[PDB]
RNA sequence: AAGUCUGGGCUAAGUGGUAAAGGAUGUGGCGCCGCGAAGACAGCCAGGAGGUUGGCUUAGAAGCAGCCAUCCUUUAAAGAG
């Protein structure tokens, strides 16, 4: 979750996260995170190494598009 | 869930006597009778003592429990026997045989001798660890207790007599 | 340093060792000195200088007005 | 010992016994040791 | 805290304690209720002592329901006198309460912050009380 | 959603005999009959906890007859808080006034913010036909705000029931919180 | 009663979905031996077929149920069913014994197998990929 | 003066034989649920995990200064604790 700060638009996440969104992404620039942080998991898919991106989208607020 | 319907299992051959009240335990290592309710039924089968409750209320499941394993104690009694280690802490501190009897080294301007009771034998083999053996657990126990009590162990420091296995906690001191 | 209701600032190695920095009211400093040095078992000490003023909190400013 | 009208398990460590007659507190923590008066 | 902003009548009667509730025994509010199990006076500074202690527990939170209300007037003469030269000077207020009357109410909060609360509300309170859960019997009132 | 009870005749038996025996007295009436009866407290208890004045209630009774029922008044112990009587409404062909209960479907922005849904009626008054009794009236509830309101008019109906109540009646809301911030002038 | 009816549904399927499943005692196995032989036994393999890890009591009613050989092992102690008819071994099971027949003491171990539809004995399904 | 009267039950405090809020594995009778040979409860033998030092903070807060957020993943299992 390095790489979901240069793919944002802040470089420190959003203050208050969940109620307030100050940068996003769409379903697919949630797997080029993917693409890089794979042998860094457990897992060996994609879309699920995309949803451990989906699921630290929450931890500095910026949200996904879909 | 229940301590007195256990099945004491009896080691070849030490022999559990049956009477009013008591039981004899005889074994390799002495001999040692065990006091039981007229209540409850000490029963003696094949390498094997078992012990009923005339009821299920209260005092009898009490009981129960209990004299199962007062007898199982009295059986590992006189077959293994029984022993407890103390662990002397301390710089000063360091303890001996003096005949039968253990001196105690522990920072009091005396040093104290304590003398073992009949069945009781005191061991030191390093000089900071002594160990209580007998065939009573519960002699034992207290004497092993008795002789701790002297110097207990310390709240700031690890300094005392010690169970074998006892842990040392401590609080700073300022 | 926080039951003298000072605010930390710092902790570095210097000689190694390891030095400290903080904001401390001058008034919860008096024999600072000796409490450090019982703190430290004698192995600890400080330098100390001025820096600005601030708000004394409500409810100890007012007992030295009378 | 605190001793007082209500006793009371204190921390999930704490055990309520009943020796002689007396309700008491015990615990790892010395200072939840309770008894009853 | 509770008294009546104006009174037809300052000093009233005593009267008695007989009986249980005329009304007000039922839930008709919140999701749980703290119910009164003796008969009592309870004064107005007991009312507001239980109220906050209900609402510190909530910490920004819940809502409390007060079903009760202080307007009969307490009369006390002044310390130290003798008996007669009337009536004693009003010196605060209190709500006559009879066992199973509801007192409090709190909704919209768990079930143990509930419980707790109205727990510990009771302490505050000179009589002993039972805490209830709204029920089907309620509703039907 | 249709429950059943056993429910027995009774005459000159003492109400506080049959209470001590653990029977609960009542009667059972309608336009047309009107009979002193009791049943069991413990099974109409069971029984009464999710029927409540809501959902019908069968009296299977001991001569054979199986009158379906609603609960119209249950009359409580004051100090003890336990029922002592119930009436039991005799349900026939025609239109019935009766409550339908509330579900307050939906989460409100009000309580989003701390706020606390008020369910002001948990159920509504409600003309409809015993065949037609519905079990649920869902109300969203979400788009209210501090504070907001609803009034029964805001009300849907499945056809065939007519709302027995003032629409100018209210129907849940949402209100501030208790807080502490507020102790500080209390 | 309980979620143990829901636990005869995924063992009697993936099971009556075999013929050759062994099993094993995924015991001892810290965190890394934890993704060890779980992994790896997908690197020889197909589907999440390592073990299955299961109630010992549940996959003898299994076994039982389905009429599966009754699997007769010895299914006391720690037991997961090592899954090769979910994948596509029989001697593959040599990846299993490799990091087993090292790893730590003892590693991953076995006591059980059924043979294609039969009984692979005691060391039998632990030689049979040796 | 007249029963160490009969039958059923409870109480182990000399309660009976001087008191309240409140506290309690005292004892006994009820009751309604929950888990339980598809192996529960107790003890005990494994594991109890990675994305992740969870955003940012403090010079460190890395599951538990601490705020908000709080998913999924390899899973028999494992709470961003
Ligand atoms: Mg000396
Ligand atoms: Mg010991
Ligand atoms: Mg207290
Ligand atoms: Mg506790
Ligand atoms: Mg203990
Ligand atoms: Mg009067
Ligand atoms: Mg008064
Ligand atoms: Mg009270
Ligand atoms: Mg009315
Ligand atoms: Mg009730
Ligand atoms: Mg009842
Ligand atoms: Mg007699
Ligand atoms: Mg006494
Ligand atoms: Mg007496
Ligand atoms: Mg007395
Ligand atoms: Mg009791
Ligand atoms: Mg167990
Ligand atoms: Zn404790």
């Not at chain 1, 979750?1 to 959003?14: C, D, Q």
């Not at chain 2, 000089?127 to 002297?150: F, H, L, M, W």
């Not at chain 7, 010992?56 to 299994?62: D, M, N, V």
Request: charged fraction near 30%; glycine fraction near 8%.
């Amino acid at each position: 979750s390095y790489l979901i700060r240069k793919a944002a638009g802040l470089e420190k996440g959003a203050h208050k996260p969940g109620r307030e969104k100050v940068g996003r992404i769409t379903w697919e620039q949630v797997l080029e995170i993917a693409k890089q942080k794979m042998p860094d998991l457990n897992t060996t898919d994609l879309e699920a190494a995309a949803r451990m991106i989906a699921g630290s989208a929450r931890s500095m607020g910026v949200e996904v598009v879909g | 869930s229940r301590i007195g319907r256990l099945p004491i299992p009896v080691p070849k051959g030490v022999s559990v006597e049956v009477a009013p009240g008591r039981v004899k335990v005889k074994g390799p290592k002495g001999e040692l009778e065990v006091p039981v309710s007229p209540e409850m039924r000490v029963v003696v089968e094949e390498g094997v003592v078992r012990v009923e409750r005339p009821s299920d209320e209260r005092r009898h499941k009490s009981l129960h429990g209990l004299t199962r394993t007062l007898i199982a104690n009295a059986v590992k009694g006189v077959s293994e026997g029984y022993s407890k280690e103390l662990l002397i802490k301390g710089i000063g501190y360091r303890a001996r045989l003096v005949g039968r009897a253990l001196e105690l080294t522990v920072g009091f301007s005396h040093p104290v001798v304590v003398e073992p009771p009949e069945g009781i034998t005191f061991e030191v083999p390093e000089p900071t660890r002594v160990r209580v053996s007998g065939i009573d657990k519960q002699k034992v126990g207290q004497v092993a207790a008795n002789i701790r009590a002297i110097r207990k162990p310390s709240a700031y420091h690890e300094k005392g007599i010690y169970y074998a296995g006892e842990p040392v906690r401590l609080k700073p001191g300022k | 340093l926080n039951a003298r209701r000072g605010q930390i600032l710092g902790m570095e190695p210097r000689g190694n060792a390891q030095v400290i920095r903080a904001f401390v009211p001058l008034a919860e400093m008096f024999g600072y000195a000796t409490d450090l040095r019982s703190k430290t078992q004698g192995r600890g000490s400080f330098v100390m200088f001025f820096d600005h003023y601030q708000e004394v909190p409500k409810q100890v400013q007012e007992k030295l007005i009378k | 010992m605190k001793v007082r009208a209500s006793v009371k398990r204190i921390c999930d460590k704490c055990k309520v016994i009943r020796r002689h007659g007396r309700v008491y507190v015990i615990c790892e923590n010395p200072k939840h040791k309770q008894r009853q008066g | 805290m509770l008294m009546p902003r104006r009174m037809k009548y300052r000093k009233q009667q005593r009267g008695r304690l007989k009986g249980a509730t005329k009304g007000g025994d039922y839930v008709a509010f919140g999701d749980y209720g703290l119910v009164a199990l003796e008969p009592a006076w309870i004064t107005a500074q007991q009312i507001e002592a239980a109220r906050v202690a209900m609402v510190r527990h909530f910490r920004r939170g819940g809502k409390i329901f007060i079903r009760i209300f202080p307007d009969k007037p307490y009369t006390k003469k002044p310390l130290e006198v003798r008996m007669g030269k009337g009536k004693g000077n009003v010196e605060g207020y209190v709500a006559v309460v009879k066992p199973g009357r509801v007192m409090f109410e709190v909704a919209g909060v768990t079930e143990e912050q509930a419980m707790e609360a109205l727990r510990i509300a009771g302490h505050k309170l000179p009589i002993k009380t039972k805490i209830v859960r709204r029920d089907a019997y309620d509703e039907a009132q | 959603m249709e429950y059943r009870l056993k429910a027995y005749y009774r005459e000159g038996e003492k109400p506080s005999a049959l209470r001590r025996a653990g029977k609960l007295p009542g009667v059972m009436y309608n336009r047309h009959l009107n009979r002193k009866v009791y049943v069991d407290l413990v099974e109409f208890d069971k029984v009464f906890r999710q029927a409540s004045i809501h959902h019908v209630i069968v009296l299977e009774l001991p001569d054979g007859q199986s009158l379906p029922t609603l609960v119209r008044q249950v009359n409580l112990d004051k100090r003890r808080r336990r029922p002592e009587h119930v009436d039991f409404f005799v349900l026939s062909d025609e239109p019935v006034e009766m409550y339908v209960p509330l579900r307050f479907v939906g989460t409100p922005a009000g309580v989003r913010a701390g706020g606390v849904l008020q369910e002001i009626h948990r159920d509504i008054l409600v003309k409809v036909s015993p065949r037609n009794i519905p079990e649920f009236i869902e109300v969203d509830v979400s788009g209210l705000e501090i504070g907001d309101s609803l009034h029964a008019s805001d009300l849907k109906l499945p056809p065939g029931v007519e709302l027995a109540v003032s629409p100018e009646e209210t129907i849940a809301a949402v209100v501030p919180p208790e807080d502490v911030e507020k102790l500080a002038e209390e | 009663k309980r979620n143990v009816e829901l636990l005869a549904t995924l063992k009697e399927n993936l099971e009556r979905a075999q013929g050759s499943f062994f099993l094993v005692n995924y015991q001892g196995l810290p965190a890394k031996e934890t993704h060890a032989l779980r992994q790896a036994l997908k690197q020889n393999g197909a589907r999440l077929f390592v073990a299955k890890n299961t109630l010992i009591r549940l996959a003898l009613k299994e076994l039982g149920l389905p009429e599966l050989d009754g699997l007769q092992g010895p299914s006391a102690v720690v037991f997961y069913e090592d899954p090769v008819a979910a994948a596509k071994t029989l001697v593959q099971f040599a990846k299993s014994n490799p990091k087993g027949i090292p790893q730590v003491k003892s590693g991953l171990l076995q006591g059980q197998i059924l043979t294609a539809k039969d009984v692979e004995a005691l060391a039998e399904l632990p030689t049979m990929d040796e």
